[PDB]
Write a protein that binds this ligand. Structure first.
Ligand SMILES: NC(=O)c1ccc[n+]([C@@H]2O[C@H](COP(=O)([O-])OP(=O)(O)OC[C@H]3O[C@@H](n4cnc5c(N)ncnc54)[C@H](O)[C@@H]3O)[C@@H](O)[C@H]2O)c1
Ligand SMILES: NC(=O)c1ccc[n+]([C@@H]2O[C@H](COP(=O)([O-])OP(=O)(O)OC[C@H]3O[C@@H](n4cnc5c(N)ncnc54)[C@H](O)[C@@H]3O)[C@@H](O)[C@H]2O)c1
Ligand SMILES: [Cl-]
Lengths: 210, 211
C-alpha cells in the first residue's frame, strides 16, 4: 500500500527543507512548513508522524536532521540503477529526458527489435532484451517498461526473472508480478482531468472547501 | 514550492476506485470503504463528496454507479473534449497512438514545424504546420498536449494561447507563462521513481504484520 499523496507531500517538504537550509534556517516549525507548502501545520505534523518523524513541540524540527530522514525513507540518498525496456518512441524520448536526478541512474536500454539493438543512445547502447539476466543482477534495480501492452506482461515476467526490484510501468495494463516486486503505473489522465475541471471552473480553488 | 491542489486529484482517485468496484460487481459502497481504498479518512471522503453535492445522509453510503456518474459530471468527463498535440516528435507520436484517452478526450489536431513531419499521416489525421493553429483551434480544440523541446516550449504555448487554447497539458520540463484564463498542468513521467524506491525499501509498509 503506497501512500501516493502522502509521498508527493513528503517530496514537497523535502524540497522546502532544502531551501530552508540554504537560507540558513536550522529549525523549522510545522507552522513555517505548512506556510511554505500551503498545507495546515496540523497536516504537516500528521504526515511527518505518519512517516516516523515526530516533532519537538515549541522548538521545531531540526532542518538538516529532518531533511536527512526524508531522504532516507524515500531512498533518495541512494544511487539506483535503472534500465528502459522497449526503446520505441516513448522509451527513446525518456532516455533523453533530463529529469532523472542523481538518485536514479540509467545503466541499460533493451529492445527485441534487431534494427534497434546496437543503436547508441544517451549514456549507452541498445542491447537485446534477451540479455536482461546477464545485465540486471547487481546493477539494475528499476525498469521503465515502455513496450506495447501486448507484450508488457511477458516483458515483466522476464524482468522479474532477471531480478528486477521495481517497475515503472507505462503500458496500459495491470501487471502481475510477485509481491516482492514493486510496480507503479504511470499515466497523464489525471492531469488531463484536472485540466478539464479547471477549464469548467476557472476561478475555483480548493481553499473554498475550507 | 507549494503542494499542488489535491482535492480534484482525490475525486479522480475515487472515480478509479469506483470504476474498479463496479468492475467487481460491487453495487454499493461507503465513505469508509472508499476512504480505505483511496488511503484517506472516511471523514475526508464525506467532506469531499458533501462539498461537491454527492453525499446523501450519514450512513446511507453511496450507490457505485450513481456516484461514478456524478464524479464524471463534476470532473467534466461526461463531455467530449477536443485535443491536439503540438510537437510530433518521439513523445508526441507515441501520444497520438496512446489507446487510453477514452471517450472524454478526442484528438483532433497534430502540429509540428518540421517540413519532414508536416503532411505525414498519423492516427486520425495528418500532421499540420503549427501556423494552422489559429484556424484549427477555435470551437474545435480546447486542450493542447505540449511535447516540444524545452527551448521551444514558451513560444509554442504563446502560439496556443493566441489561437484560443483553454488548457495545456505541458510535458516540457519548464514552467510556462500563460494568462490566468488558460489552465496548465505539467506532466512528470518520472514522479513514480520515488514511489518505487520508497516501496522497494519499505516492502511491508504499514501492514498488519511486517515481520
Ligand atoms: N503511460 C502513458 O502516459 C503513455 C503515453 C505514451 C504511450 N503509452 C505506452 O507506452 C508504450 C510504448 O509506446 P510507444 O509509442 O513508444 O511504442 P512503440 O511501438 O513506438 O515502441 C515500443 C518498443 O517496444 C519494443 N518491444 C516490443 N516488445 C518488446 C519486448 N518483449 N521486449 C523489449 N522490447 C520490446 C519494440 O521493438 C519497440 O521499439 C505502449 O504500451 C504505449 O501504449 C503510455
Ligand atoms: N514530462 C515527461 O515525463 C517527459 C518524458 C519524455 C520527454 N519529455 C519532454 O517531451 C518533449 C518532447 O521530447 P521528444 O523526445 O519527443 O523530442 P523530439 O526532439 O523527438 O521531438 C520534438 C518535436 O518538437 C517539434 N517542435 C519544435 N518546436 C516546435 C514548435 N514551435 N511547434 C510545434 N512543434 C515543434 C520538432 O520539430 C520535433 O518533431 C521535450 O520537452 C522533452 O524533454 C517529458
Ligand atoms: Cl498525478
Amino acid at each position: 500500500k503506497v501512500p501516493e499523496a502522502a509521498i508527493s507531500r513528503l517530496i514537497t517538504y523535502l524540497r522546502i527543507l532544502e531551501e530552508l537550509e540554504a537560507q540558513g534556517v536550522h529549525r523549522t516549525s510545522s507552522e513555517q512548513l505548512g506556510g511554505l507548502a500551503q498545507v495546515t501545520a496540523f497536516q504537516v505534523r500528521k504526515d511527518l508522524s505518519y512517516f516516523g518523524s515526530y516533532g519537538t513541540r515549541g522548538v521545531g524540527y531540526t532542518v538538516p536532521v529532518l531533511k536527512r530522514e526524508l531522504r532516507h525513507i524515500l531512498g533518495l540518498n541512494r544511487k539506483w540503477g535503472l534500465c528502459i525496456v522497449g526503446m520505441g518512441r516513448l522509451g527513446s524520448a525518456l532516455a533523453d529526458y533530463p529529469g532523472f536526478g542523481e538518485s536514479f541512474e540509467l545503466r541499460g536500454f533493451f529492445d527485441v527489435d534487431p534494427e534497434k539493438v546496437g543503436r547508441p543512445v544517451r549514456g549507452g547502447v541498445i542491447e537485446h532484451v534477451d540479455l536482461l539476466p546477464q545485465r540486471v543482477p547487481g546493477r539494475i534495480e528499476i525498469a521503465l517498461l515502455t513496450v506495447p501492452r501486448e507484450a508488457a506482461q511477458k516483458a515483466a515476467d522476464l524482468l522479474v526473472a532477471a531480478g528486477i526490484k521495481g517497475i515503472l510501468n507505462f503500458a496500459p495494463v495491470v501487471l502481475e508480478v510477485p509481491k516482492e516486486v514493486a510496480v507503479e503505473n504511470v499515466d497523464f489522465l489525471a492531469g488531463l482531468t484536472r485540466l478539464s475541471f479547471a477549464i469548467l471552473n476557472p476561478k475555483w480553488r480548493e481553499e473554498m472547501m475550507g
